[PDB]
């Protein structure tokens, strides 16, 4: 079993960028597969992307991707997601997530839940 | 809860949610029954009570003889070679040796249960668990009857019975196991006194809800070992578990061969998965359990026991990711026998279904409610009560879960048949891969001695004659030397 | 009438006549025990017979307790994966929902058997088999005279150990066994109990029958299930076999190494038939049973699983015609290990005798009377008692039939020793035949290049000056210069 | 009198020191019961201790209604034999006309006697149990069929004890289908067993090793349920003969040997196969491969001839050097190189490869030896187990002296690039054959490829002729043509 | 199990031909060995021809040898016998059998049988 | 259980040869390994030679080097040590030996042994 803490939320205009981190204790991420979820105020937990080894394939929400960027560092104790070209509507709490078995996007699947960072972007 | 996902690609399904209870270690205990040292009682005769104490003494002195003289004595072949009562056998020995038993019955004079420390300098706790010795000593050779021989209480025929039962069954269970028992009766340590020496164990209090809350499945891997009787003692050690890994994660892997589905009865090739069994997460790496049979599931508690056990990296989850992943070399095995089957996961049936095979799914009130085809398919339980594969009918899991089907080609038919090895117990995706790479190349260099011979030009004529080459034929050298002839550059 | 072919070609033997009885389903019923819910007699006193009532009390409590801790809770490889105890288990699911202990309480007031129907529209036959609680509450407690805490008759002391002994029993069957048992003890249900099952059962008359003149290899089948004990009511589900499939024609095939007898040691090359096992007809094709020492074979009748079976086409049976048939792929192992043994089969021996062992048949009471040469060979067993091979002394099965000795080439002197694939554990005629095809092609394309590249041209001479050629040979062009070659006809 | 070698070069064991005790033959005997045919006591009353007679009495009629119904590595390479073949032999000569009658003809004023049955076999039956005489004659008379009572509440518990054995067999069988092994004190007592002992065809020395171990014999005895009639209950109880006895035995332990390269994947491996008990027997070598199923009490070894291989004396040269002319020593190949441990007689086999963490501690876990990377060995001298990975070994303790016998591991003389790595019942010798077929193979492909080389091939199709030079093709007119000069 | 039934018997006169058939049902014969026996009046029934798949391995008596053919359909669902050159001598009932097992002549080792046809030839 | 009898002891002078040999009885040396050994007065057993099999592995102790020649028969009914050059301290009475195992020159892992015989060399 795998802890997970989120890091790196805030505020930003329209336009700007963030970067969330998320660190592994007791074990690390190897031969895990880490996804990161957001959840907006009075929606469901939705998939942002998921990676399952440092430098392996990724999968991105129809949402996000040209302009989010997943990665794990060599190490496999963080999972990084590099945020770019934020809009108003990435306005949620992110989470990171892990689970052994396979890389999918249903969020009842994964094992394993950071306690969420906050993400607010402005017009 | 419980959750499960079939990955398509590979036939294979992960059951997960689970959390872990392995046996690690053992701890060994000493058990004593106190003796009387009665050889025979002298009776005039005629009182049918006496008669009757008579014969449960018999009973009593055979069961002395008997014990006496038992004193005096698919990846699952990786796995290593253990001795299972070591541990237990090893404090049986030091009990032989003499000085000890006194020690024990010292230790044990006034109370009940008394740690006693041996020759050995271990500390093994011991229990008395019975005395028969103060029993006959006291309740019945006191009331002998008279020297008449004549007891005057059909209640205290009836209570020697009720006292001598324990050890007569206690003689029984070591008569036929050779002096070693498993699982441990209740005849060996009842429910109390497990529960009370649970209580005594060097555990954290985790591990003693976890032992006392599930104490049917310590009893089965439990063992008792009969040791000495001597001094008017009977002492057997106990040997429990120790459950050093508890409530880490464990997930279960399923199996079933992935073939080609060619209507050519001979043609096709088949993959199978061979990691299949149980994985629980154990300090940084994964204890893989080939055996899942062997291991015991109490709702979502896995007991396994880590002498079934190997010691893999992590990343072997990364199997169920993509078993082409480059982090760790996925176990596979080959062949070309297509015959059909089912694997019963822990949410559903994997049905493996090839050739002229009927595969179908069904529930109780309403009958079939999907036919597979040819291939490797699955279905969970929701709404599915049986599967059948040919001439056998299965009856699924029903355990509530959430099962996901993941979508993805079947992996078998990314392989050309003309240079697939057929034929491996114990391979692997990089070993498969490289065979077939040095049988390409054993290919092509055969085609280039054929290409090269294909362009060579025969032999010139044989006649005492000059040739040269000249639009694909040999042609006279006198032919140009009749004429003169120009520099054509 | 049992008969049995010996084939000297495969070094195998078919025993046949046999009749089917396989397990293919499950059916489960609801066993519940009435129980009394009081606690300590509550007084003390001298009397030495209350002692014992109570010392049988507390036994009882003992037993309720522990049951209330249990509810909280060669081809071989090619076969599938059950769940064995799933239909059972499901029941005993729907037993734990809150209610359902009413519906077979009620359904059961007047009556000790009653068809049940519960969540899940499941509907179940549920009997009564004894009831403690009639006997402790209105039969026991109302004699305890309380001001002087004593009863009055011995007699009421042996009757009740006789009524809680059975209780007692099938605790200590489920808390060794983490609530499952299998066989199904007597003490779980009664042979009265059983066939009463077996007779009320939605079956055939024939099914009906053949279980009930097998009701000792039923209970083999079996299992037992605790499932509840709450609200004055313990339930265990009982999961019987059904025999759907009664009456076909089965087999059973014996295989043995039939290996070369070459003098040389390492010389010789083995084969064995891996498809040993038992075969019954079964709706259009044939159930395969690997394992065969799992079916059970009373008289002529086989009793075996499907759970334990694949499903094969008929053409199965042509590997004991012609190994090469062209319509199934017969399943072999190869090696170069020719160790001596015997397979004892129905009506038989085959005696696979290789090296210096030495290798016999004997009569009870004419010592000696065949010496097997090396090779695979058979006798009968008729006028054979034991056959010695090596320093094995077998007995031979004495039951009657006869046996057919088909005499006929070893297939194993078919084979080229020194392209022949040893070391093969899962293959098959046409897989070592294909293997072979590729050795022998491997030879002749490299022949057949070599003899042909000596009607091509090698390469001239490297010495900066021009060749022609001329009787198979390079000559200087420059001989030939300054000649006008006419042609004169 | 134990001792132990381990072979470094191969990564196996031998203890040696043991005796043998092997089951070779079988000895039957009848067991009889006899019976009342009381299926009732007919009268009527109040009495409770008849009422607890009339319940015991339908325990005995439900016993005899239920006995009715039941009268009417290298293990592959063993055979298959028919365990009961002979007790059920004897069994089914018991239901013939006539048989039973000899039985209680016999054994009317004796309580054991030897019969001589139809098919010319001789056997010992005994009386183990007269419940005709004790229900006809001591209990029946007893009651009062007046009143419909009996006296005395001890006549309660006498018929109790009495019918016991009678339930408890019954029971055995009716759950065994008829066939139980071991044989349980039920069947057979611990006292009607060592009589057993002492009227078989075997030697005093064998007499006196199994009845000095009965709880053995028990254990590889079977009881066959044979027919209940005319008053007689019979089963058949087939006993080992441990024909074989006091004969030198050894053990012989092995584990993986592997290449320890660091790249994870390019290593090979081979185990030896032959792992299990051998013991001498009659010249020859008895080898029984699952020793798991062999029985070993202090030295004694008490397997099964039915499990094992009759081998040549010269498989012993397996351990004195592997590639031995005389014997093809059983090997297995393979690229899993898995760490594992073996737990032998006197010590442990270590098999360590990759990051798995390896050691041996002592009573106090202190650490006394920590792995590298292959094939090792400890002795329990001072050891009480070993860690593998996740795994922990107790070792076993029993007295002894080990020998760590050097050598260099031999999967270091085998070429990886021609290794038949994945074959799981080879030898020696074929492992050899296949690597000479590899090199073969490869040396023919080179001899094709250098003899097909360096021919010419065609030249340019121009209506021009060409002659060979410095391995081309040029123009004849190059040697041949002068300068063309058109003129006028 | 499998049921058989012969038809096609009848009188011929010597020198003639017939051609006898046995069709399966219950199931086909696939994974059969059928067999035809003859039995004349006053002697034991004896061994005619045998076949186990269509276009497969033949094996005929001794007194048949030359006249007789045995063959089976594709569909493995009929046996055909036939008789060539008829003989006084080969009247008889002629019988289909079938069994599981090998290619095996004796009678006695056939498992299955059909009810039997006439053939009568006249001198 | 093979049982050893040691023959061919007695007195010799320095430089001459002796040759002893050892019997099998019970069973052949077949699969045994055969040692010699010595033991001088006042001196422990002191390992000579020893042999597994007719023409096979042989090894001497280096102080018997080049002037002891061990062999065994190709029956292995009996094994020789051929002594040429001997020496005063070669004085010793001489055991055979026998062993499953290996080729170890341990004489406490040698479990089979013979009666010894005496050999004395004088100067
Ligand atoms: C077995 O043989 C195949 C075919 O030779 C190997 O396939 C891999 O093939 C790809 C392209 O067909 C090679 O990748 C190339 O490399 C450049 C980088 O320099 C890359 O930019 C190109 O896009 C292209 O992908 C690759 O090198 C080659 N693999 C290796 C190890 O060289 C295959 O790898 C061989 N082995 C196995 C186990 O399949
Ligand atoms: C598990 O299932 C329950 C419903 O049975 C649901 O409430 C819950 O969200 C699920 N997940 C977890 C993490 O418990
Ligand atoms: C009887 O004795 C027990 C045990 O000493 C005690 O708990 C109880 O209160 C006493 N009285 C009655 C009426 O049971
Ligand atoms: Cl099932
Ligand atoms: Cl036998
Ligand atoms: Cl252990």
Redesign the interface.
């Given at each position: 079993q795998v802890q997970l803490q989120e890091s790196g939320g805030g505020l930003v205009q329209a336009g700007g960028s963030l970067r969330l981190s998320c660190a592994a204790s007791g074990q690390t991420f190897s031969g895990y597969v880490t996804g990161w979820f957001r959840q907006a105020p009075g929606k469901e937990r939705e998939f942002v992307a998921l990676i399952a080894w440092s430098g392996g394939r990724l999968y991105y929400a129809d949402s996000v991707q040209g302009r989010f960027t997943i990665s794990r560092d060599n190490a496999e104790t963080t999972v990084y997601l590099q945020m770019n070209s934020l809009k108003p509507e990435d306005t949620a709490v992110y989470y990171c997530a892990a689970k052994r078995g396979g890389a999918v996007t249903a969020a009842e699947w994964y094992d394993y839940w950071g306690q969420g960072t906050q993400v607010t972007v402005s017009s | 809860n419980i959750?499960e996902?079939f990955?398509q690609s590979t036939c294979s399904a992960?059951s997960?949610?689970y959390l872990s209870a392995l046996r690690?270690?053992?701890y060994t205990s000493v058990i004593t029954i106190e003796l009387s040292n009665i050889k025979e009682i002298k009776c005039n005769g005629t009182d049918?009570?006496v008669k009757?104490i008579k014969?449960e003494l018999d009973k009593y002195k055979?069961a002395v003889?008997?014990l006496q003289?038992?004193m005096?004595?698919?990846l699952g072949?990786?796995?290593?070679?253990?001795?299972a009562i070591?541990?237990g056998?090893?404090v049986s020995?030091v009990l032989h040796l003499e000085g000890e038993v006194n020690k024990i019955k010292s230790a044990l004079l006034s109370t009940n249960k008394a740690v006693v420390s041996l020759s050995?300098?271990?500390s093994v706790l011991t229990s008395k668990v019975l005395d028969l010795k103060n029993y006959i000593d006291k309740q019945l050779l006191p009331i002998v009857n008279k020297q008449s021989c004549s007891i005057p209480?059909?209640?205290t025929?009836?209570?020697f019975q009720?006292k001598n039962n324990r050890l007569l069954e206690i003689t029984?269970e070591?008569?036929?196991?050779?002096?070693v028992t498993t699982?441990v009766?209740?005849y060996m340590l009842?429910?109390?006194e497990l529960l009370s020496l649970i209580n005594d164990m060097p555990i954290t209090n985790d591990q003693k809800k976890l032992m006392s809350?599930?104490?049917?499945?310590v009893?089965?891997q439990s063992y008792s070992i009969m040791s000495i009787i001597k001094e008017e003692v009977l002492a057997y050690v106990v040997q429990l578990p120790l459950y050093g890994?508890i409530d880490?994660?464990c997930?279960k892997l399923?199996t079933?061969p992935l073939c080609t589905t060619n209507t050519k009865?001979?043609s096709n090739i088949c993959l199978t998965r061979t990691d299949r069994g149980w994985?629980c997460?154990?300090?940084?790496?994964?204890?893989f359990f080939p055996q899942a049979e062997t291991c015991?599931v109490?709702?979502n508690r896995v007991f396994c026991d880590?002498?079934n056990?190997?010691?893999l990296?992590?990343?072997?989850?990364?199997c169920?990711?993509?078993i082409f992943?480059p982090?760790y070399?996925c176990?596979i095995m080959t062949?070309?026998?297509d015959?059909?089957?089912?694997?019963?996961t822990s949410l559903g049936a994997i049905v493996?279904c090839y050739?002229?095979?009927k595969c179908t799914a069904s529930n109780?009130?309403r009958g079939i409610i999907k036919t597979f085809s040819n291939g490797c398919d699955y279905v969970s339980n929701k709404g599915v009560?049986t599967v059948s594969?040919?001439?056998?009918?299965?009856?699924?899991?029903?355990?509530e879960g959430?099962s996901?089907y993941?979508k993805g080609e079947p992996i078998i038919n990314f392989y050309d048949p003309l240079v697939f090895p057929?034929?491996?117990?114990?391979?692997?995706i990089?070993?498969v891969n490289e065979k077939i790479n040095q049988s390409l190349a054993?290919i092509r260099?055969?085609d280039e001695?054929l290409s090269?011979?294909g362009?060579?030009?025969?032999?010139?004529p044989?006649?005492?004659?000059?040739?040269?080459?000249?639009?694909?034929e040999?042609?006279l050298?006198?032919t140009?030397?009749?004429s003169?002839?120009?520099?054509?550059?």
């Amino acid at each position: 079993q795998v802890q997970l803490q989120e890091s790196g939320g805030g505020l930003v205009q329209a336009g700007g960028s963030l970067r969330l981190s998320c660190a592994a204790s007791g074990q690390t991420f190897s031969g895990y597969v880490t996804g990161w979820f957001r959840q907006a105020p009075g929606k469901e937990r939705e998939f942002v992307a998921l990676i399952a080894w440092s430098g392996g394939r990724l999968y991105y929400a129809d949402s996000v991707q040209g302009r989010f960027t997943i990665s794990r560092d060599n190490a496999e104790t963080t999972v990084y997601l590099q945020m770019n070209s934020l809009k108003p509507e990435d306005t949620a709490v992110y989470y990171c997530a892990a689970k052994r078995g396979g890389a999918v996007t249903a969020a009842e699947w994964y094992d394993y839940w950071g306690q969420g960072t906050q993400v607010t972007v402005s017009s | 809860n419980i959750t499960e996902e079939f990955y398509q690609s590979t036939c294979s399904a992960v059951s997960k949610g689970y959390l872990s209870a392995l046996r690690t270690g053992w701890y060994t205990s000493v058990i004593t029954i106190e003796l009387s040292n009665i050889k025979e009682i002298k009776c005039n005769g005629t009182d049918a009570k006496v008669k009757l104490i008579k014969q449960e003494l018999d009973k009593y002195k055979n069961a002395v003889t008997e014990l006496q003289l038992l004193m005096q004595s698919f990846l699952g072949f990786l796995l290593g070679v253990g001795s299972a009562i070591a541990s237990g056998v090893a404090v049986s020995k030091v009990l032989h040796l003499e000085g000890e038993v006194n020690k024990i019955k010292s230790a044990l004079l006034s109370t009940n249960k008394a740690v006693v420390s041996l020759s050995n300098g271990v500390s093994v706790l011991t229990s008395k668990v019975l005395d028969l010795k103060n029993y006959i000593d006291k309740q019945l050779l006191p009331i002998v009857n008279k020297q008449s021989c004549s007891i005057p209480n059909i209640e205290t025929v009836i209570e020697f019975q009720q006292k001598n039962n324990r050890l007569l069954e206690i003689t029984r269970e070591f008569s036929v196991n050779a002096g070693v028992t498993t699982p441990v009766s209740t005849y060996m340590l009842t429910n109390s006194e497990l529960l009370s020496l649970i209580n005594d164990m060097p555990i954290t209090n985790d591990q003693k809800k976890l032992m006392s809350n599930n104490v049917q499945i310590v009893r089965q891997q439990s063992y008792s070992i009969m040791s000495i009787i001597k001094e008017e003692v009977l002492a057997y050690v106990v040997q429990l578990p120790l459950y050093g890994v508890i409530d880490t994660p464990c997930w279960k892997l399923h199996t079933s061969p992935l073939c080609t589905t060619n209507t050519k009865e001979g043609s096709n090739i088949c993959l199978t998965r061979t990691d299949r069994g149980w994985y629980c997460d154990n300090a940084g790496s994964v204890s893989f359990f080939p055996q899942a049979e062997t291991c015991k599931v109490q709702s979502n508690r896995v007991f396994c026991d880590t002498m079934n056990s190997l010691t893999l990296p992590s990343e072997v989850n990364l199997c169920n990711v993509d078993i082409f992943n480059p982090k760790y070399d996925c176990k596979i095995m080959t062949s070309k026998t297509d015959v059909s089957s089912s694997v019963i996961t822990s949410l559903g049936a994997i049905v493996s279904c090839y050739g002229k095979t009927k595969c179908t799914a069904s529930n109780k009130n309403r009958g079939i409610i999907k036919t597979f085809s040819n291939g490797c398919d699955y279905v969970s339980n929701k709404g599915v009560d049986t599967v059948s594969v040919g001439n056998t009918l299965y009856y699924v899991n029903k355990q509530e879960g959430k099962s996901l089907y993941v979508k993805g080609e079947p992996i078998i038919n990314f392989y050309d048949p003309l240079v697939f090895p057929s034929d491996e117990f114990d391979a692997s995706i990089s070993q498969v891969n490289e065979k077939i790479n040095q049988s390409l190349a054993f290919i092509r260099k055969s085609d280039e001695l054929l290409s090269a011979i294909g362009g060579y030009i025969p032999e010139a004529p044989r006649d005492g004659q000059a040739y040269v080459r000249k639009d694909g034929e040999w042609v006279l050298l006198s032919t140009f030397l009749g004429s003169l002839e120009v520099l054509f550059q």
